[PDB]
Amino acid sequence: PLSETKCTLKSFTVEKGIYQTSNFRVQPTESIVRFPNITNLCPFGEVFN
Amino acid sequence: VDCTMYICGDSTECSNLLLQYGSFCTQLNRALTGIAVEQDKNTQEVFAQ
């Protein structure tokens, strides 16, 4: 974190304060893909049952 | 502004294209930071009397 600041400021020494050096973002852990169901349920059971 | 997110972030392909512009939005991230600091100093001048 101190070296994040030193390069951001182009310096080998740092003055007191807060320096923004980057950004963080949380990435996806899973993919949720949802497509709607078919109302007219398929009669496979009419051949098997 | 997270200018990566603003232009097109969380994409390898967008990042590679955004990077062809160097510091094009970095300078604005710095300009907004400078404005926010000026606004804090301005608040202190008005109220911390």
CSV table of N, CA and C in Angstrom, one decimal:
chain,number,residue,atom,x,y,z
A,1,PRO,N,0.8,-1.2,0.0
A,1,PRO,CA,0.0,0.0,0.0
A,1,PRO,C,0.9,1.3,0.0
A,2,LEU,N,2.0,1.3,0.7
A,2,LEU,CA,2.8,2.4,0.7
A,2,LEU,C,3.5,2.6,-0.7
A,3,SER,N,3.8,1.5,-1.4
A,3,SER,CA,4.4,1.5,-2.7
A,3,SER,C,3.3,1.8,-3.8
A,4,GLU,N,2.1,1.6,-3.4
A,4,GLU,CA,1.0,1.9,-4.3
A,4,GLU,C,1.0,3.4,-4.4
A,5,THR,N,1.2,4.1,-3.3
A,5,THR,CA,1.2,5.5,-3.1
A,5,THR,C,2.5,6.1,-3.7
A,6,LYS,N,3.6,5.5,-3.4
A,6,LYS,CA,4.9,6.1,-4.0
A,6,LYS,C,4.9,6.2,-5.5
A,7,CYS,N,4.4,5.1,-6.3
A,7,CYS,CA,4.4,5.2,-7.7
A,7,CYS,C,3.3,6.1,-8.2
A,8,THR,N,2.1,6.2,-7.5
A,8,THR,CA,1.0,7.0,-7.9
A,8,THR,C,1.5,8.5,-7.9
A,9,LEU,N,2.3,8.8,-6.9
A,9,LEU,CA,2.8,10.2,-6.7
A,9,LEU,C,4.2,10.4,-7.4
A,10,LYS,N,4.7,9.4,-8.1
A,10,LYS,CA,6.0,9.5,-8.7
A,10,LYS,C,7.1,10.0,-7.8
A,11,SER,N,7.2,9.3,-6.6
A,11,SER,CA,8.1,9.7,-5.5
A,11,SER,C,8.7,8.6,-4.7
A,12,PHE,N,9.9,8.8,-4.1
A,12,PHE,CA,10.5,7.8,-3.2
A,12,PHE,C,10.2,8.1,-1.8
A,13,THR,N,9.5,9.2,-1.5
A,13,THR,CA,9.1,9.7,-0.2
A,13,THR,C,7.6,10.1,-0.2
A,14,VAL,N,7.0,9.9,0.9
A,14,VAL,CA,5.5,10.2,1.0
A,14,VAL,C,5.2,11.1,2.1
A,15,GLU,N,4.4,12.2,1.8
A,15,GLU,CA,3.9,13.1,2.7
A,15,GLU,C,2.6,12.6,3.4
A,16,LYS,N,2.3,13.1,4.6
A,16,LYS,CA,1.1,12.6,5.3
A,16,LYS,C,-0.2,12.9,4.5
A,17,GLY,N,-1.1,11.9,4.4
A,17,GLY,CA,-2.4,12.0,3.7
A,17,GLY,C,-2.9,10.7,3.1
A,18,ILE,N,-4.0,10.9,2.3
A,18,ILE,CA,-4.6,9.7,1.7
A,18,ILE,C,-4.5,9.8,0.2
A,19,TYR,N,-4.0,8.8,-0.5
A,19,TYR,CA,-3.8,8.9,-1.9
A,19,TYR,C,-4.6,7.8,-2.6
A,20,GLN,N,-5.4,8.1,-3.6
A,20,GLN,CA,-6.1,7.1,-4.4
A,20,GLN,C,-5.1,6.5,-5.4
A,21,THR,N,-5.0,5.2,-5.3
A,21,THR,CA,-4.0,4.6,-6.2
A,21,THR,C,-4.7,3.6,-7.3
A,22,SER,N,-5.8,3.1,-7.0
A,22,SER,CA,-6.5,2.2,-7.9
A,22,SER,C,-8.0,2.0,-7.5
A,23,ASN,N,-8.6,1.0,-8.1
A,23,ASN,CA,-10.0,0.6,-7.8
A,23,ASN,C,-10.1,-0.9,-7.6
A,24,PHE,N,-11.0,-1.3,-6.8
A,24,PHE,CA,-11.3,-2.7,-6.7
A,24,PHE,C,-12.7,-3.0,-7.1
A,25,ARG,N,-12.9,-4.2,-7.7
A,25,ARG,CA,-14.3,-4.6,-8.0
A,25,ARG,C,-14.4,-6.1,-7.7
A,26,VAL,N,-15.6,-6.5,-7.1
A,26,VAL,CA,-15.8,-7.9,-6.9
A,26,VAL,C,-16.3,-8.5,-8.2
A,27,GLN,N,-15.7,-9.7,-8.6
A,27,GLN,CA,-16.0,-10.4,-9.7
A,27,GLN,C,-17.0,-11.5,-9.5
A,28,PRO,N,-17.8,-11.9,-10.4
A,28,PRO,CA,-18.7,-13.0,-10.4
A,28,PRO,C,-18.1,-14.3,-9.8
A,29,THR,N,-18.8,-15.0,-9.0
A,29,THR,CA,-18.4,-16.3,-8.4
A,29,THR,C,-19.1,-17.4,-9.1
A,30,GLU,N,-20.3,-17.1,-9.7
A,30,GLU,CA,-21.2,-18.0,-10.4
A,30,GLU,C,-21.9,-17.3,-11.5
A,31,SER,N,-22.4,-18.0,-12.5
A,31,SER,CA,-23.2,-17.5,-13.5
A,31,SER,C,-24.7,-18.0,-13.5
A,32,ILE,N,-25.6,-17.1,-13.4
A,32,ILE,CA,-27.0,-17.4,-13.3
A,32,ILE,C,-27.7,-17.1,-14.6
A,33,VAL,N,-28.1,-18.2,-15.2
A,33,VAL,CA,-28.7,-18.1,-16.5
A,33,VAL,C,-30.0,-18.7,-16.4
A,34,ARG,N,-31.0,-17.9,-16.8
A,34,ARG,CA,-32.4,-18.4,-16.6
A,34,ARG,C,-33.2,-18.2,-17.8
A,35,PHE,N,-33.8,-19.2,-18.4
A,35,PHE,CA,-34.7,-19.1,-19.5
A,35,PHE,C,-36.0,-19.6,-19.0
A,36,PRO,N,-37.2,-19.1,-19.5
A,36,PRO,CA,-38.5,-19.5,-19.1
A,36,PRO,C,-38.8,-20.9,-19.5
A,37,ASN,N,-39.7,-21.6,-18.7
A,37,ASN,CA,-40.2,-22.9,-18.9
A,37,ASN,C,-41.3,-22.9,-20.0
A,38,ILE,N,-41.5,-24.1,-20.6
A,38,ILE,CA,-42.6,-24.3,-21.6
A,38,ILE,C,-43.8,-24.8,-20.9
A,39,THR,N,-44.9,-24.0,-21.0
A,39,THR,CA,-46.2,-24.3,-20.4
A,39,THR,C,-46.8,-25.6,-20.8
A,40,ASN,N,-46.6,-25.9,-22.1
A,40,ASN,CA,-47.2,-27.1,-22.6
A,40,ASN,C,-46.3,-28.2,-22.4
A,41,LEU,N,-46.4,-28.9,-21.2
A,41,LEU,CA,-45.5,-29.9,-20.8
A,41,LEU,C,-45.6,-31.1,-21.9
A,42,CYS,N,-44.4,-31.6,-22.2
A,42,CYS,CA,-44.2,-32.6,-23.3
A,42,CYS,C,-44.6,-34.0,-22.9
A,43,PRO,N,-45.4,-34.7,-23.7
A,43,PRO,CA,-45.9,-36.0,-23.4
A,43,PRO,C,-45.0,-37.2,-23.6
A,44,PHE,N,-43.8,-37.2,-23.0
A,44,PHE,CA,-42.9,-38.3,-23.1
A,44,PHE,C,-43.5,-39.5,-22.4
A,45,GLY,N,-44.2,-39.3,-21.4
A,45,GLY,CA,-44.8,-40.3,-20.6
A,45,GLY,C,-45.9,-41.1,-21.4
A,46,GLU,N,-46.4,-40.5,-22.6
A,46,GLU,CA,-47.4,-41.2,-23.3
A,46,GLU,C,-46.8,-42.3,-24.2
A,47,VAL,N,-45.4,-42.4,-24.3
A,47,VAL,CA,-44.8,-43.5,-25.0
A,47,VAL,C,-44.2,-44.4,-23.9
A,48,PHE,N,-43.6,-43.8,-22.9
A,48,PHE,CA,-42.9,-44.6,-21.8
A,48,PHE,C,-43.8,-45.2,-20.7
A,49,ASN,N,-44.9,-44.5,-20.3
A,49,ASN,CA,-45.9,-44.9,-19.3
A,49,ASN,C,-47.3,-45.3,-19.9
B,1,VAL,N,-15.4,8.9,-10.5
B,1,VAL,CA,-15.7,7.9,-11.5
B,1,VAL,C,-14.6,6.8,-11.6
B,2,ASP,N,-15.1,5.6,-11.7
B,2,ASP,CA,-14.3,4.5,-12.0
B,2,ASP,C,-14.4,4.5,-13.5
B,3,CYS,N,-13.4,5.1,-14.3
B,3,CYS,CA,-13.5,5.3,-15.7
B,3,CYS,C,-13.3,4.0,-16.5
B,4,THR,N,-12.9,3.0,-15.8
B,4,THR,CA,-12.8,1.7,-16.5
B,4,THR,C,-14.2,1.2,-16.6
B,5,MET,N,-15.0,1.3,-15.5
B,5,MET,CA,-16.4,0.9,-15.4
B,5,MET,C,-17.2,1.7,-16.3
B,6,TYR,N,-17.0,3.1,-16.3
B,6,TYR,CA,-17.7,4.0,-17.1
B,6,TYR,C,-17.6,3.8,-18.6
B,7,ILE,N,-16.4,3.6,-19.1
B,7,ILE,CA,-16.2,3.5,-20.5
B,7,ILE,C,-16.7,2.0,-20.9
B,8,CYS,N,-16.1,1.0,-20.3
B,8,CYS,CA,-16.5,-0.5,-20.4
B,8,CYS,C,-15.6,-1.3,-19.6
B,9,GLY,N,-16.0,-1.7,-18.4
B,9,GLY,CA,-15.1,-2.4,-17.5
B,9,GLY,C,-15.5,-3.9,-17.4
B,10,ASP,N,-14.8,-4.6,-16.6
B,10,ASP,CA,-15.0,-6.1,-16.3
B,10,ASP,C,-15.1,-6.9,-17.6
B,11,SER,N,-14.2,-6.5,-18.5
B,11,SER,CA,-14.1,-7.1,-19.8
B,11,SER,C,-12.6,-7.1,-20.3
B,12,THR,N,-12.1,-8.2,-20.6
B,12,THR,CA,-10.7,-8.3,-21.1
B,12,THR,C,-10.5,-7.5,-22.4
B,13,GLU,N,-11.5,-7.7,-23.3
B,13,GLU,CA,-11.4,-7.1,-24.6
B,13,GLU,C,-11.6,-5.6,-24.5
B,14,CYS,N,-12.6,-5.1,-23.7
B,14,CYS,CA,-12.7,-3.6,-23.5
B,14,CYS,C,-11.5,-3.0,-22.9
B,15,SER,N,-10.9,-3.7,-21.9
B,15,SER,CA,-9.8,-3.1,-21.3
B,15,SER,C,-8.6,-3.0,-22.3
B,16,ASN,N,-8.4,-4.0,-23.1
B,16,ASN,CA,-7.4,-3.8,-24.1
B,16,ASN,C,-7.6,-2.7,-25.0
B,17,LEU,N,-8.9,-2.3,-25.4
B,17,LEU,CA,-9.2,-1.2,-26.2
B,17,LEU,C,-9.1,0.2,-25.4
B,18,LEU,N,-9.5,0.2,-24.2
B,18,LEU,CA,-9.4,1.4,-23.3
B,18,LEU,C,-8.0,1.8,-23.1
B,19,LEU,N,-7.1,0.8,-23.0
B,19,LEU,CA,-5.7,1.1,-22.7
B,19,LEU,C,-5.0,1.7,-23.9
B,20,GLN,N,-5.6,1.7,-25.1
B,20,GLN,CA,-4.9,2.3,-26.3
B,20,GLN,C,-5.0,3.8,-26.2
B,21,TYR,N,-5.7,4.3,-25.2
B,21,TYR,CA,-5.8,5.7,-25.0
B,21,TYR,C,-5.0,6.2,-23.8
B,22,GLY,N,-4.2,5.4,-23.2
B,22,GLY,CA,-3.3,5.8,-22.1
B,22,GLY,C,-4.1,6.4,-20.9
B,23,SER,N,-3.7,7.6,-20.6
B,23,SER,CA,-4.2,8.4,-19.4
B,23,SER,C,-5.4,9.3,-19.8
B,24,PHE,N,-6.0,9.1,-20.9
B,24,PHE,CA,-7.2,9.8,-21.4
B,24,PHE,C,-8.3,10.1,-20.3
B,25,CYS,N,-8.6,9.1,-19.4
B,25,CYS,CA,-9.6,9.3,-18.4
B,25,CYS,C,-8.9,9.4,-17.0
B,26,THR,N,-7.6,9.0,-16.9
B,26,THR,CA,-6.9,9.1,-15.7
B,26,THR,C,-6.8,10.5,-15.2
B,27,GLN,N,-6.6,11.4,-16.2
B,27,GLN,CA,-6.5,12.8,-15.9
B,27,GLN,C,-7.8,13.4,-15.4
B,28,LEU,N,-9.0,12.8,-15.6
B,28,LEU,CA,-10.3,13.3,-15.2
B,28,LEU,C,-10.5,12.7,-13.8
B,29,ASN,N,-10.0,11.5,-13.6
B,29,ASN,CA,-10.2,10.9,-12.3
B,29,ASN,C,-9.4,11.8,-11.3
B,30,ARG,N,-8.3,12.3,-11.7
B,30,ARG,CA,-7.5,13.3,-11.0
B,30,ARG,C,-8.2,14.6,-10.9
B,31,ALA,N,-8.8,15.1,-11.9
B,31,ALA,CA,-9.5,16.4,-11.9
B,31,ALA,C,-10.7,16.3,-10.9
B,32,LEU,N,-11.4,15.2,-10.9
B,32,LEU,CA,-12.5,15.1,-10.0
B,32,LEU,C,-12.0,15.0,-8.5
B,33,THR,N,-10.9,14.3,-8.3
B,33,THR,CA,-10.4,14.2,-7.0
B,33,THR,C,-10.0,15.6,-6.5
B,34,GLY,N,-9.4,16.4,-7.4
B,34,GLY,CA,-9.0,17.7,-7.0
B,34,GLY,C,-10.2,18.6,-6.7
B,35,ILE,N,-11.3,18.4,-7.5
B,35,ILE,CA,-12.5,19.2,-7.2
B,35,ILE,C,-13.0,18.8,-5.8
B,36,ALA,N,-13.1,17.5,-5.5
B,36,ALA,CA,-13.6,17.1,-4.2
B,36,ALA,C,-12.8,17.6,-3.1
B,37,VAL,N,-11.5,17.7,-3.2
B,37,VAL,CA,-10.6,18.3,-2.2
B,37,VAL,C,-10.9,19.8,-2.0
B,38,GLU,N,-11.1,20.5,-3.1
B,38,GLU,CA,-11.4,21.9,-3.1
B,38,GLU,C,-12.8,22.1,-2.4
B,39,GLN,N,-13.7,21.2,-2.6
B,39,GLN,CA,-15.0,21.3,-2.0
B,39,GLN,C,-14.9,21.1,-0.5
B,40,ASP,N,-14.0,20.2,0.0
B,40,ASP,CA,-13.9,20.0,1.4
B,40,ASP,C,-13.2,21.2,2.1
B,41,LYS,N,-12.3,21.8,1.4
B,41,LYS,CA,-11.6,23.0,1.9
B,41,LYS,C,-12.6,24.1,2.0
B,42,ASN,N,-13.5,24.2,1.0
B,42,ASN,CA,-14.5,25.2,0.9
B,42,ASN,C,-15.5,25.1,2.1
B,43,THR,N,-15.9,23.8,2.4
B,43,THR,CA,-16.8,23.5,3.5
B,43,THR,C,-16.1,24.0,4.8
B,44,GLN,N,-14.8,23.6,5.0
B,44,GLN,CA,-14.2,24.0,6.2
B,44,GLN,C,-14.0,25.5,6.4
B,45,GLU,N,-13.8,26.2,5.3
B,45,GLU,CA,-13.7,27.7,5.4
B,45,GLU,C,-15.0,28.3,5.8
B,46,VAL,N,-16.1,27.8,5.3
B,46,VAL,CA,-17.4,28.3,5.7
B,46,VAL,C,-17.8,27.9,7.1
B,47,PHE,N,-17.6,26.7,7.5
B,47,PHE,CA,-18.2,26.3,8.8
B,47,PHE,C,-17.2,26.2,10.0
B,48,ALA,N,-15.9,25.8,9.8
B,48,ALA,CA,-15.0,25.6,11.0
B,48,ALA,C,-14.4,26.9,11.3
B,49,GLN,N,-15.2,27.8,11.9
B,49,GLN,CA,-14.8,29.2,12.2
B,49,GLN,C,-14.6,29.5,13.7
